[PDB]
Amino acid sequence: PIRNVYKKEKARVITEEEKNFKAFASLRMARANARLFGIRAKRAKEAAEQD
Amino acid sequence: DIRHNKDRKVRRKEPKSQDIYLRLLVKLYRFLARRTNSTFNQVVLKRLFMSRTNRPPLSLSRMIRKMKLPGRENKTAVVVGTVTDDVRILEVPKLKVCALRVSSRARSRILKAGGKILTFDQLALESPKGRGTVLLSGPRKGREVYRHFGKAPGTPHSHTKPYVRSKGRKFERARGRRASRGYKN
Amino acid sequence: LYGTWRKAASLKSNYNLPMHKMMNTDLSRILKSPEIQRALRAPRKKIHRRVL
Amino acid sequence: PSRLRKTRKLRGHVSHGHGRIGKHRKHPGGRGNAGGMHHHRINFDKYHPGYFGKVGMRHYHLKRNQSFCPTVNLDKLWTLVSEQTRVNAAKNKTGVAPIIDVVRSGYYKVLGKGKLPKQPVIVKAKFFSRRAEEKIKGVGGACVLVA
Amino acid sequence: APSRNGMILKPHFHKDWQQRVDTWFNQPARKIRRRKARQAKARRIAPRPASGPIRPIVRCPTVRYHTKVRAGRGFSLEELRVAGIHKKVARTIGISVDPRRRN
Amino acid sequence: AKSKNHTTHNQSRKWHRNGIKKPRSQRYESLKGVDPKFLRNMRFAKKHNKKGLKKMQANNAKAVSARA
RNA sequence: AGGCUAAAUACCGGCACGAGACCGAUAGUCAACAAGUACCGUAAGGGAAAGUUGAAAAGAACUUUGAAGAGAGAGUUCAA
RNA sequence: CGGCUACCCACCCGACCCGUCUUGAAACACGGACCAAGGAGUCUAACACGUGCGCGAGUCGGGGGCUCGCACGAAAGCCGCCGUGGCGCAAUGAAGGUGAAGGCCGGCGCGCUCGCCGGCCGAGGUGGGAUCCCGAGGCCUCUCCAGUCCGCCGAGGGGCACCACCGGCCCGUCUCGCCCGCCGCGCCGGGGAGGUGGAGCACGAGCGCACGUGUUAGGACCCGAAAGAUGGUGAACUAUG
RNA sequence: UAUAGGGGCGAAAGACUAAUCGAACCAUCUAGUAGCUGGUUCCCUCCGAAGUUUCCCUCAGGAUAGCUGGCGCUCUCGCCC
RNA sequence: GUAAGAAGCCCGGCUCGCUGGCGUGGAGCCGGGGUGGAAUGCGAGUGCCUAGUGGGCCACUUUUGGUAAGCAGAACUGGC
Ligand SMILES: [Mg+2]
Ligand SMILES: [Mg+2]
Ligand SMILES: [Mg+2]
Ligand SMILES: [Mg+2]
Ligand SMILES: [Mg+2]
Ligand SMILES: [Mg+2]
Ligand SMILES: [Mg+2]
Ligand SMILES: [Mg+2]
Ligand SMILES: [Mg+2]
Ligand SMILES: [Mg+2]
Ligand SMILES: [Mg+2]
Ligand SMILES: [Mg+2]
Ligand SMILES: [Mg+2]
Ligand SMILES: [Mg+2]
Ligand SMILES: [Mg+2]
Ligand SMILES: [Mg+2]
Ligand SMILES: [Mg+2]
């Protein structure tokens, strides 16, 4: 059958920078960049046009 | 003379359920509350006549908090009705409790802590007059039916959750819930 | 097939024996036990009928 | 049960529990939700506010699979894994933390609730709330983003 | 028509529905027919297993179910080519082939 | 078809059948309609009370207990 | 902008079968019986009522009254 | 001899003919000559409340599959890596989206209308609140001695549920200003203090089955129109060639 | 023998069209709808009204409030206050 | 219409970003002490669901239109 299997990843020691690795601000910045990707490109284009 | 509209007490004096064990518990606690002259026996006899709604299921964490209060070290917690397990707490004290129809998930969680539980007949055999006891009850108004009650969902201070077929947009939102369409409550 | 109160059933996966409400279903022994009658009230079997 | 219904005890009463002055006429007030805006406006505005009109913008061809995002709370974050994991973490043999993946249980977002145990955890989820993210780091845990 | 307080209802019984009502009084007979058909097919094809054609590993498309995996229709032509067996012989071997699926 | 227009006959009986009892008077009635500035000041005084209460009031309680 | 194909699906008509917490002759299909029959209207069409002797006819031989219908005796049946 | 009555008769008193529309019925208001049989609040779906049951932050196999062909079997039993799924466990915005823990103690930076740090339990406080606990005091053969023996209570304490208020947290808004971060230093993100709107949170109670009532859609308590549409039959009567 | 139903025919009465004509007959939709009449079946026990406010093309009706009943639930007496 | 107490009064101390000559005023909180506060009668509070009703009439008294009416229209109370 197609019974599901799952990777274990039992336990591990937390690294040093994991306390400040990710955050809610990371997802917020990712969403903001995905929303304002093309606008920044058009702004850079019209800025290089004036030069 | 005097009107006879309120002469008959509407309270019930006999359990509507046909459970044989509940009938025997009533027959025992009636004799106790009649003889021992204990107000605790009186109230625990009155709470056995109550229906399914008037006997709300008391959770486990609520009973933990009620027993953690000062003066409840060795006192026995008594819940007329079902006590249910709570998965939000992780550790539990001894918790020597007597209840009716304890849930199986809470059975092991209480028996692993070291405390022993007992039923109503064992409680009557141990302490007839109800000494060293704490009578607890679950949230009677915590039921969802009491959230649809009030004066009316139209008064500007309703907060009464009107009955709606499906919850979401364009379902009882436009005229009477915002100042843009008509009025605001 | 049904299991006991200690171990669940083997044939049925998530079934356990029903819970038992009154551990002692004999009212006579409970009412005649010394612990119950230790703190009882007087019988007071007087009728006190209507007096003319 | 016809023997338990009310119509049996109504035999002999001519009006059948409906009165002599106003008889039981076939839909005397209207059929269905008739006249929701007039001659029923009092009831419709007292018991169903907001029923008339449109509020929000329309979304053509909405799929309930896109907005599928179940939420899990911190008080339930330990009910997903087994019980022995919690005691093995509380034993504290070294600075190792158990990994609690909510995607296996079926939750995509973790929401914040208080009273966390003092054990460090490594959580893997697609979305995190700000309060939950600060509360898991105030105890010494770690948050891992997946996709 | 309305009462003191109650949920507003919109029953879809305004059409002439009583002349088209499907009662499932033949459900046990249908289940018995299906079971007898399964048994007869298995007895006729006894050396071959029931649901003979092997089905590949298939991930759910939508984001709601893309975390779990399920069965499918047939193996792709690329998978058949990497396996090294011909396309047309897999059908008589007992391997269901899905030419529309890509990798 | 002229009919009766408006009378208040047999109304006091209907009222007195159930009762015209006064509304429920309870302590801490409400804080609605009160001046918003006064309410803000009261909230500030309530939230800043425990800052200096638990020390000076405790000292004064110890002092009066020593007095009597 | 060309085509073929069984499967699970539906079936108040048709040919047979089984069953019923249904109806029991003003009920149940209109129709338990020579029922879509008698009958009605030019026609399209409308459309009924109507079961029970007795276990077995063993359906009352014979005498008398009456022209007969019918009746008095008698006779069969546990029972006319 | 005793006997009420479903037998008959007589006297005394009271006694208008039933059903419904109506403020008003015995009416010169309507229906009923009489008798026998039939005759009217049903069933389905959905909703709300209450009650009984089982389980319980879970609940439900009604949809399929399995065991052996079965009169009772169109039943019943089981699925366990069939819980897909429905309801509930999270709400708030039109939406992009966001999305609920308080309390005590000490210290520092101007303990500043002031943040952080360390330790603890961990869902705040007030006024009521069944019940429970402690409890001065006195209540049992001659006496100082006792554990049971007789046996209630002034006052005080922690306080179920629930009630009223204050404060706290979440989401959508308006005012005020300042701070922090950089997978990249921007009309990028995050945060505070105050006023309001929410069907919210502030140790959860729902699910499935049955019953009763009430509303509604189904012909829907029963009987009743003037009318509309579809498709066919009639100039053997009558009007006209 | 020809004209057949919103059609025919009419020296015109809206007369005739199979005893029916200011729109025939037959079957179906159709158990069409009715805020309008009539009826609505056994006993006992308990409680027991309103013809009033507001709104509606509302006035022979309905919604709302009020009157009523049922199910309860939370407490209080029962041993100088 | 209101009041005739313990949800009250006297005392001390804290908080305020409200106001401000003033430790001024006003609110909130804490702490210990003192219930017998007009008569009479009575057990109260509260939640849910809900049928019927939504044509009324009459009477003492006060009253509007009308000459008047067993006329039409109102207020309290009682009755059908
Ligand atoms: Mg009465
Ligand atoms: Mg009646
Ligand atoms: Mg009505
Ligand atoms: Mg009326
Ligand atoms: Mg009604
Ligand atoms: Mg229709
Ligand atoms: Mg009127
Ligand atoms: Mg093609
Ligand atoms: Mg084709
Ligand atoms: Mg086929
Ligand atoms: Mg039957
Ligand atoms: Mg017949
Ligand atoms: Mg002869
Ligand atoms: Mg009658
Ligand atoms: Mg009438
Ligand atoms: Mg009249
Ligand atoms: Mg009459």
Ligand SMILES: [Mg+2]
């Ligand atoms: Mg009459």
Ligand SMILES: [Mg+2]
């Ligand atoms: Mg007449």
Ligand SMILES: [Mg+2]
């Ligand atoms: Mg007559």
Ligand SMILES: [Mg+2]
């Ligand atoms: Mg009959």
Ligand SMILES: [Mg+2]
């Ligand atoms: Mg699921």
Ligand SMILES: [Mg+2]
């Ligand atoms: Mg009809």
Ligand SMILES: [Mg+2]
């Ligand atoms: Mg029309």
Ligand SMILES: [Mg+2]
């Ligand atoms: Mg035609």
Ligand SMILES: [Mg+2]
């Ligand atoms: Mg001719």
Ligand SMILES: [Mg+2]
């Ligand atoms: Mg026409």
Ligand SMILES: [Mg+2]
């Ligand atoms: Mg004619």
Ligand SMILES: [Mg+2]
């Ligand atoms: Mg016509």
Ligand SMILES: [Mg+2]
């Ligand atoms: Mg009908």
Ligand SMILES: [Mg+2]
């Ligand atoms: Mg009216």
Ligand SMILES: [Mg+2]
């Ligand atoms: Mg009432």
Ligand SMILES: [Mg+2]
């Ligand atoms: Mg009542």
